[PDB]
Each structure stands twice: as structure tokens, then as C-alpha cells.
Scaffold this active site. Structure first.
Site, PDB file in Angstrom:
ATOM      1  N   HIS A 176       0.806  -1.209   0.000  1.00 23.78           N
ATOM      2  CA  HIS A 176       0.000   0.000   0.000  1.00 23.78           C
ATOM      3  C   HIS A 176       0.844   1.266   0.000  1.00 23.78           C
ATOM      4  O   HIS A 176       0.273   2.347  -0.067  1.00 23.78           O
ATOM      5  CB  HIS A 176      -1.058   0.000   1.120  1.00 23.78           C
ATOM      6  CG  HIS A 176      -0.548   0.159   2.516  1.00 23.78           C
ATOM      7  ND1 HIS A 176      -0.406  -0.906   3.375  1.00 23.78           N
ATOM      8  CD2 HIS A 176      -0.290   1.266   3.244  1.00 23.78           C
ATOM      9  CE1 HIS A 176      -0.027  -0.465   4.566  1.00 23.78           C
ATOM     10  NE2 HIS A 176       0.069   0.850   4.504  1.00 23.78           N
ATOM     11  N   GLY A 185       2.309   5.577  10.082  1.00 30.22           N
ATOM     12  CA  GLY A 185       3.694   5.592   9.672  1.00 30.22           C
ATOM     13  C   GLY A 185       4.486   4.365  10.079  1.00 30.22           C
ATOM     14  O   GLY A 185       5.659   4.250   9.700  1.00 30.22           O
ATOM     15  N   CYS A 244       3.844   1.186   9.261  1.00 31.30           N
ATOM     16  CA  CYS A 244       3.778   0.012   8.405  1.00 31.30           C
ATOM     17  C   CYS A 244       5.146  -0.293   7.812  1.00 31.30           C
ATOM     18  O   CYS A 244       5.961   0.600   7.552  1.00 31.30           O
ATOM     19  CB  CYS A 244       2.727   0.190   7.309  1.00 31.30           C
ATOM     20  SG  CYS A 244       1.057   0.084   7.994  1.00 31.30           S
TER      21      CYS A 244
END
Ligand SMILES: [Mg+2]
Ligand SMILES: [Mg+2]
Lengths: 301, 301
Positions: free
Chosen positions: A42, A143, A145
């Protein structure tokens, strides 16, 4: 009396040296091993597309140069590929600090260490057990991930988790490095079914053994429940089915208390502690593994 | 619903690169900063003298060469000195991985990160709060002495703890890097008086704010207890006196719940939760600080 149990993570230095920032179009974290950087797919998603991304089309729309990889250096991307919910970016420089490593999948009830990172910067480390519904009770914000989870055997780091998302109930889930999400989860920002959580029976047994090892054994009786009988009971009472291991057997030998004695105790304690405490708790604890107890209390690794 | 709170340690890499093994005559751990190696002075003690060592005489009996310092390299000792309960060994090579650092003393209720080491090898990391009786509820075995605790501000590591001993009740204590033991403890293997532990009121307040931030506020009432009144009550009920901080004030602003409302709640909850739970617990939790809650839930650092 303190049990001598804490939430113990591996030292994080080997993994800190593998963390990078990846930016494509938000910014998240990646894991740089040899000539490969792994990160959540993503990173490619525009913010207005997070609820229903078409990842195949997004991947097609990127070039190698679309991906900006920075270590706090700039690593030039020379190849890009998608595997499940992860991107595999090939970079022109091999990480000189790559540890010996494997990829593995962690099973419910098993513990692993997490290095929480933001903007490619390691910020904290903690340990979690994989829940029976394939979430973890973590501590992750926007933030994070691409933060990774791992176990360690000798000098070898076994990477098992890359952070992807927070669920409505505040827990977390992510991917294995084969790109599969844990559980039935999808990497899309929509509400999703969550399976029930359950008590991890093997870890409750471990904790009761930790209690005995600390002189707390008021709950031990001669009464026994067989593994087969307990597992039938577990299915009706939101417990995992119990599967003994060598680690549990070592605790049974050291304490002289049979597993079946503690399976009986669990059934009774689940109905209530009656004001009594075990290692300072009035409820069953399932966040410590048999291995935790063997290592931390008995020094057996 | 999961609070998003975990026991969070700093990343340990910077400190891992400072750990060494020290042997003189058992083997324990040392901390190598610049041209200095710090270690517990009982490295000098024969095993049959641990209960009543004469450390002044032992120090006199050693030469520089008596101290064997190894990193997993051999560091040649060119000076030795005793400060309180620590040795300061001067070595001929400055650690090239010395971080920016300070020495500080941690206060009751404050959290710090521990790097547990054996034979100079980092083995695990965890976080503890300094208890009001100057013990920590750690996880340490034989060979762990010289393991260090620290906080971190920016890039600067603030070393605050060097492990020395386990107490009869299973807790732990150690030295500050001025060589003083925390509390009234002595680095001698004899039974010693232990002060009472207490609930850390500021951390209980922090945890109740964490509950509110997670939608759990059933315990909030208009009723208020003043700080002065609460502190009188605390002295009769095994609580620390409450001293508010900017960190607590930020939680009061974000939630709209006054500190005095939660001091009243604590007094009532201490009499019993009446079967109700707060963030999955039926007892007060004091192991998370206001800073933990601000950082982990609100992302305010
Ligand atoms: Mg113990
Ligand atoms: Mg949350």
C-alpha cells in the site's frame, strides 16, 4: 513475590541495521536484506484509494524510479515485483549488515519480537504473542507500516511479520514474508470480520508452571483432566485446544506436577479465582510461552 | 478492545555495541564507553567471600593485568579504580561505537530499558519502572550482573542502572553510574531489609487516562479529590504521593477529564472494581508512565 517474568524481546541491533524508508507518490518502512527491500504494497496507494485499491493496476503504473528508498543513503531501485501483500524491490547495493536470516510464519500462541519504526527510524521494541484470531495486541501508529517482527535461533533471525494495519478493536495484523496476510485479513482500509480471540491454553499452562516454580501452588490438586477431555471443554469455553510440547514436558519434570493437573486447575480457575491471586493476577495469563518460562526462570535455552 | 499499550523498550543496538565481558579471578558484563569499562566490583570477589567482601583489600590485591576484558577482541587494561559499587577500568582502545551519552539516576515510577547480557553477549531487552522501594521487577539470572539500564533523549543514551543483585522476593537492584546503589541496598550476598513497595499514583493516573483515550470511562464521576487530600490518603494506603507533570496535564487536556477526578476514582477503585474491568484488568495498573501513554497512544514525543 515477583515471578522473574518480563516481556522479553530479542536485542534489536541486527534488525535496526536493515531498516529503510520507502516512499512512492505516504512514506513507510522497508526491510533491506542482500539486494532486496521488502515493504507493504500500500505504499503505492493514493490516500483516497486506501479503501478499495487496485494493486495490480498501481504496480503496472510504477517504474523502478517511482520508488524512493533511503537509509538513515539513497538506494537505487533496479527492479520491482509484487508478492501477495508485499513489494520486493531490487536495489543496486547489497546491505553489508545483512544478518543470517530465514523467513518463517508464526503460529497462534507463539511469541515474537517487533521493531517499531517510523520514517525508517527504529523507535521501540516489544514482544507479542500471535493471537488465535491472527491479530497481535501491539502498539503501532500512522507511519509504522513495514515495521517487522522476528524470532531468533542462534545468530539467525527468522523474519515472520511485516506490519500492515490496525483493526477496529485496536489490535494489529500484517503479512508473512511470503506475502500472505495472517488470518483472513485483507490489506484494504475497510471494516472486516474478526474471528473470536481465545485463551492460549499451552501458555496458561506455562504460566501456572511459572507460579509453581515461584512457590505458588495453592491451585494444584490431585485431580486431573485428560488432554482429550480438556480439548472438548476448550471448544465450548473459548480456549485453544492444548497440544503439549517438549518445553511443557521440561516444566512438568522440574516441578513434579503433571500437565493434566494443570488442565483441571484451568477449568476450575476459569470459573473464578475466589479472591485468590496467582503471581499477582486474578485472571488467567496467556501472554508467556513455555519457552519464556524455561529461559527466564530456569535458564534453559 | 486493546489499549494499544505495550511494554516498549528503546532499540538496543547502540548499547549492544558497548557490552563486554570482564573476568577477574566469576565472569560478568561491562560497559565500554570511550577508554573506560564499567563493571560491578564483585567481579573481584572469590565465591566464598560474596557474603562479606572486603572490597578495599580486594582492589589493592589486583593489578591492571588481573582484569580480563573481552568483546565478542581483548582490551588491555591500563588503569583500575573503584567508585562506590563499580569498577572503572581504563583500557588502551577507545570504543569506536561509543554513542553520545550521559549518566543519570532514575526516580521511582520512571521507566527505563534494560539490556540483559550474559558473558558479554546481549540476550534480551525489556523495560521496567523503578519501584518506590528502589527495586525493579526484572528478569535476571546468574551471570547477568553488569547488564545495563538506560533512557534515551534524541540520540543521547542516558545510562541509569548497572545490575548487581536479586533480592529474596525475586526483585532486582543495582547501581547508578556514580557507584551508589539504589535505595539502602548493599552489594553483599546477605539478606537485607526491603522497604515496602507502593502503588505509583502518577502512573495509575496515566493508565486511567489511557482507558479514557480508549473509550473506557465508566469510573469517571464529577466527584474530585484534591492533590493535597489525596496525598494524605496515599500515605495511609500504600500509594506514592502524587506530583503532577506537564505530561499528565497533556492527558487532562486531550481527554477533558481533570486530574482530581481520577484521584477520586483511584480512592474508590482501590476499595474494589466490583466485578468491572478497566482495559482488561480488575486491579490498578502502575507500570505505564504518562510519557508511555502520550507516546504510544497519542504519538506525542
Ligand atoms: Mg526469580
Ligand atoms: Mg489504539
Amino acid at each position: 513475590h515477583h515471578s522473574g517474568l518480563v516481556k522479553m524481546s530479542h536485542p534489536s541491533g541486527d534488525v535496526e541495521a536493515c531498516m529503510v524508508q520507502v516512499t512512492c507518490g505516504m512514506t513507510l518502512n522497508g526491510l533491506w536484506l542482500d539486494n532486496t527491500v521488502w515493504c507493504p504494497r500500500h505504499v503505492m496507494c493514493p490516500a483516497d484509494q486506501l479503501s478499495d485499491p487496485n494493486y495490480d493496476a498501481l504496480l503496472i503504473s510504477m517504474t523502478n524510479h517511482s520508488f524512493s528508498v533511503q537509509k538513515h543513503a539513497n538506494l537505487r531501485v533496479v527492479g520491482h515485483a509484487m508478492q501477495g501483500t508485499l513489494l520486493k524491490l531490487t536495489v543496486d547495493v547489497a546491505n553489508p549488515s545483512t544478518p543470517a536470516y530465514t523467513f518463517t510464519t508464526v503460529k497462534p500462541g507463539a511469541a515474537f519480537s517487533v521493531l517499531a519504526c517510523y520514517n525508517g527510524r527504529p523507535t521501540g521494541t516489544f514482544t507479542v504473542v500471535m493471537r488465535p484470531n491472527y491479530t497481535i495486541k501491539g502498539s503501532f501508529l500512522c507511519g509504522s507500516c513495514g515495521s517487522v517482527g522476528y524470532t531468533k535461533e542462534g545468530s539467525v533471525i527468522n523474519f515472520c511479520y511485516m506490519h500492515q494495519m490496525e483493526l477496529a478493536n485496536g489490535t494489529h495484523t500484517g503479512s508473512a514474508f511470503d506475502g500472505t496476510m495472517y488470518g483472513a485479513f485483507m490489506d484494504k482500509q475497510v471494516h472486516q470480520v474478526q474471528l473470536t480471540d481465545k485463551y492460549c491454553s499451552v501458555n496458561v499452562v506455562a504460566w501456572l508452571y511459572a507460579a509453581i516454580l515461584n512457590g505458588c501452588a495453592w491451585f494444584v490438586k490431585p485431580n486431573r483432566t485428560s488432554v482429550v477431555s480438556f480439548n472438548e471443554w476448550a471448544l465450548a469455553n473459548q480456549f485453544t485446544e492444548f497440544v503439549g510440547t517438549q518445553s511443557v514436558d521440561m516444566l512438568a519434570v522440574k516441578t513434579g506436577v503433571a500437565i493434566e493437573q494443570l488442565l483441571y486447575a484451568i477449568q476450575q480457575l476459569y470459573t473464578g479465582f475466589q479472591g485468590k491471586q496467582i503471581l499477582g493476577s486474578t485472571m488467567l495469563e496467556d501472554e508467556f510461552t513455555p519457552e519464556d518460562v524455561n529461559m527466564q526462570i530456569m535458564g534453559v535455552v
